[PDB]
């Protein structure tokens, strides 16, 4: 199932299917006298208490069997070589199943100073996960902060089981952030953060979000294809939900409108690092990718280093041309909102004016 | 005639033949965390002094002649095992001869506990019907409440005769209105409800209204197929016309704003869960669907309950990843209006934020 | 040339080519209760001190030599039969040769009844005609009107010579209109008529418009291909030129805006009895047609009584679908302005709501 | 490499590639009356001390070997036949190399009246060229004005080296205009102008832009074409920057409206006399041109010359159709802005009726 998951997302047609980031609504203005020498760019940034070399995360996908491991390796050696944190995919399977846990562990082993980020899934704290199984996915790699995901489009879609996300669940989140001592990222799963998703979470104590957005990885996509798999009748309801959810681009503005001083991944379909100065630019702090990294993780590890090579020339080039020296001044950097995005600000409340100033600190 | 209707209707190419309900310009607001479980979900609302299952109705189609009250039987016996609400086809040709008459009873015989929805057209209001007649349509099947259809572009088009609306339809329907024991619903028949229209019927006290918009069934297409049939020279006016009308989704902006309380049926082109979801989130207290039913219909009972699961769990997944847990948080829920149906909206002076209010309360 | 002219327009491919009307900007509410029966419109409307049947026109386009006063002579007894006004073409070779007046007199014989609309350029005002030319123009077919025609944009591109347009002409056509007993109105020739221009006849006591718009018959195509048939330079000129002009719909709104007391005709790309509706609810008084009407009389009188047939059986369906009993119900009738449309009269200064109130009053 | 560009832009296909000027989002508004006759009209206009013939420049190109001399001599030649200020490429070759300078100089040999304009790029006053350099370059063609190069885009996707625009070469260009006796234009390389970029330049006393925005020449793509060529990897990185820039449009509305008192060249993307109609209507003093040139001189003199009469009658065009009598008329004449370049504009800050007093004050 991990590995179908993998498979499908790996080797079939669901990246972007029938869904937009709504990234082409950005455009980053062009600064003919950049005002700075390509050289003296600084990409480094902060990611809690670390500090990293390029504002961009891998963030969770797998892990809980061997082969699976050896895809975790891959992509954390060289996030290692990079100074680039690394979310690993949900760690359930690993708090049931001791065998399970060298697939996760060995990520820490290969990557001893960079952030590394746990992962398990909101609908475990109403299916008794609580403070023990949370200390258990931190130590298990000694992470340095824990993603707790939210998937209900997947789940709704996939051929078991129903979504659960009662309002116990946070306020069981609420009482495990008193006693971790690493901060909880809540991330979505390709279906995007909403204002009132992302208020809802803040007056529960969660400060961190990982947008995951649509545009990206199509998870309503993935399930679907698991269903025509097996001749299960969800399918077509899910082709009909395929470009369900906030787009990344969206869902960066209402995270950072509803919750200004919020730690931001920007993700869902980050592809470049001209994607990556976007999301940056409009509001996050840092970007995420996933299925790429997979892509080319399963190439293998020369095939990922040139990946990452050409992720940070784009992110480079996108500061040079913007006039951007650092991460900081990137944040800060003029661009045009146009087309669906902006009619999308303009319904949801999103004053373009009260956004320019929230986005510049 | 009844049966050509039926046969163009089922087998041709008319569903939304070059027209649009304007619901590609709705999008309901993905909750990541819907503060609600998938089992929870509660999809009953009130349909006058009944109770229903789920906030759809099968809208009037059929009847007349035993090949259709075979139909009719199907599509009763379904929604009673369902608990959805089914309105007939015109009974005209029921009050003129006794033989049609069993063609429409057979529904309550198969469905004696939803409310069942008689039909009669507004332009034989000028052609002599009155009380008697309306109390025969209701009689025949222990409706529980009466249609009232207006269908003056499908008139225009068609071969034969020509339309007829004059106010003194009103003035009588006013009367008639005075001494039925049931309510009047008014609907259209593919071209859509306007605010002008919407408002002149509420000074006659029409209080419940059925959309009909354009971009479902397409009747002026459906003429024109009977025209081209018999070399009849308004095929190609016909053809000029295949947009006309207000948009599903415009009409029911439209109605919701200018009678605020009203009981508003959303129909014309609801062809999935969502777009019954999308409906009832922009201002309808339940969606109409008729052409998708009387194709599964055709197929057969299994078909028909495969049909309504489908349109059923669709429903809920938008109600789930909505973090609606009934059908009033689902008329409440967060959305956003972009595109051809905002310009609409704003061109006819309306307000989005009343709007937002009105849909809400 | 006259025939080179026509042989163009009639069998190549410039009608609305790389042009538009901007008409699918404007959506006329359908109103599912009209208030009307069909057999009570009425279509009747003033033209000058004459009553015609139904608000279109035949606007100016041929005569001149034989076989085009046999095309004339074929429109001219439908438009009578039909008590529609008919516009001859450029009377200038007809005031040099008496050869040339039979071919335009023709009209007169067999349309004892309806308006006829002589036809002179505005150039010719510059070039030595005067009151004289203008009266035995108007004397040769008993004319109620005279059209003066502005083709700037055909004379840019056309083989031979080149435009003038002094003010000086304006001068002598307000001189003439003082001793003239019929009224002037002033035409385009496929590329529309702005506010500026509107305004500018206006000063000079013009008060009578035919916008003949972009998106019809494009003289800057036909100029084009006349020039690539010479082998003349200035055929991809004319090509880049080819969405040159004000779109029809545009220049309804910039001429009822700007002179809200004119007589207007809307015309330009009038194609069915829907743009003529669309035309009139926009602003126009009447609606303009030339092309159409040309190709129908070449394939013969009975195609040109369909084709008319047609026209009106399409606009009584607007106006039945509109709930218009009459011309002057449909001027005042509910529309929706999108699109590129909306866009350009928000650029151009034109408030909406000042609109509104304008083409209704 | 000098012919590897000309080759490139010459041959393949880089001409507006997945880039945009937003031209099609400007209107000149068509007079039916233009007030004026053809032969009227002037189109002369001032290039600092001289008169030109056409507002309408020659942009720099190339330059630096006998094959580029050769295609220089052709544009000088034709230039100077037609009234039409040149400027040369990069002159960097020539202030290294004497036998380069010949290819510069045979300009002014050929072309003795027409302003005549230098080139030196902006990293060049990083790279220690100063007031001597400049003046070589301008006396090795006794200059009339020197153009400083943009190019940062160009510089980072090229295979050699990375762009240094430190403001140290700004304060240096300051203190060089000090001493230089004619003057400096800042042009971009299409990649465009934007209002920071122009408002800091005139805040160290530059008063003259070329705008080079995107839409025509693809630089970025130029060097992606030069990077697969030597299967160098920053190829695939160049392809996602392909539509990296401020459009030839929007760059003539920002630099128009920050620097209200420039002297301004919209280039990039100009391919008819009715693309330099708009650019100058738009808020440009003058219309530039490079690749169309370049391929119509590569073809022959007599080819250049047919281009410049096209050229110049689109453009005369274009002026009789508004009513613009002289190149001062056709600034204030009236436009229409629509779609993404109003949405640009809006998203800028650019207040449109402010706009509209400053492009014709
Ligand atoms: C194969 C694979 C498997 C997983 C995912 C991704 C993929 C591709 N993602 C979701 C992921 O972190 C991310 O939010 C989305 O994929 C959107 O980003 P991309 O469009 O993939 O860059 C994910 N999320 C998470 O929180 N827990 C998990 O275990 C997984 N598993
Ligand atoms: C074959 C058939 C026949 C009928 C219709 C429909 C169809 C498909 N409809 C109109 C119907 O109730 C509905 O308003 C429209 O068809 C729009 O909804 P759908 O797009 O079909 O869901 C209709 N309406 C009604 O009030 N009286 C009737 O007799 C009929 N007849
Ligand atoms: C063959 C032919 C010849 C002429 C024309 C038209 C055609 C088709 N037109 C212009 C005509 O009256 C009308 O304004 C435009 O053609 C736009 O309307 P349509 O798009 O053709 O309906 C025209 N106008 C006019 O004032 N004097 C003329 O002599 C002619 N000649
Ligand atoms: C072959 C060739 C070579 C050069 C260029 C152009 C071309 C086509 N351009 C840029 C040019 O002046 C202009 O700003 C852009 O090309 C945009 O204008 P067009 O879209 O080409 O009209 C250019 N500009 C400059 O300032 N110095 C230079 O040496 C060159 N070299």
């Known amino acids: 199932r991990k590995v179908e998951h993998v498979e499908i997302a790996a080797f079939e047609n669901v990246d972007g299917l029938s869904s937009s980031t709504f990234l082409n609504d950005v455009i980053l203005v062009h600064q003919g006298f950049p005002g700075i020498s390509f050289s003296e760019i600084n990409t480094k940034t902060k990611f809690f208490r670390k500090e990293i070399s390029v504002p961009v995360m891998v963030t969770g996908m797998t892990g809980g069997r061997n082969e699976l491991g050896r895809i975790n390796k891959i992509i954390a050696e060289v996030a290692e070589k990079f100074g680039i944190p690394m979310g690993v995919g949900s760690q359930r399977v ?77 306020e069981k989140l609420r009482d495990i952030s008193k006693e ?52 299960n009748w969800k399918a077509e309801s899910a082709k009909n939900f395929l470009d369900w959810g906030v787009p990344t681009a969206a869902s960066i503005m209402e995270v950072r409108y509803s919750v200004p001083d919020s730690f931001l991944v920007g993700s869902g379909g980050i592809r470049s690092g001209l994607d990556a100065a976007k999301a940056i630019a409009l509001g996050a702090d840092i970007a995420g990718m996933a299925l790429p990294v997979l892509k080319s993780a399963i190439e293998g590890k020369e095939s990922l280093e040139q990946f990452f090579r050409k992720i940070i020339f784009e992110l480079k080039a996108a500061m040079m041309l913007t006039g951007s020296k650092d991460v900081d001044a990137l944040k800060k950097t003029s661009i045009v909102i146009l087309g669906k995005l902006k009619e999308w600000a303009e319904y949801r409340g999103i004053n373009l004016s009260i956004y320019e100033k929230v986005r510049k600190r």
């Open 94 to 170: 690993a708090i049931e199943k001791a065998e399970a846990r060298e697939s996760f562990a060995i990520v820490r082993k290969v990557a001893p100073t960079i952030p590394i980020i746990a992962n398990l899934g909101m609908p475990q704290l109403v299916k008794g996960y609580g403070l023990k199984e949370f200390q258990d996915a931190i130590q298990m790699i000694e992470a340095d902060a824990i993603a707790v995901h939210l998937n209900p489009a997947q789940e709704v879609f996939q051929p078991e089981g129903e979504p659960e996300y009662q309002i116990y669940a946070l």
């Open 180 to 231: 971790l001592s690493v901060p909880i990222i809540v991330k979505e799963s390709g279906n995007g953060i909403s204002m009132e998703t992302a208020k809802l979470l803040y007056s529960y104590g969660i400060k961190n979000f990982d947008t995951s957005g649509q545009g990206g990885t199509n998870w309503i996509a993935i399930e679907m294809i698991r269903d025509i798999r097996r001749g």
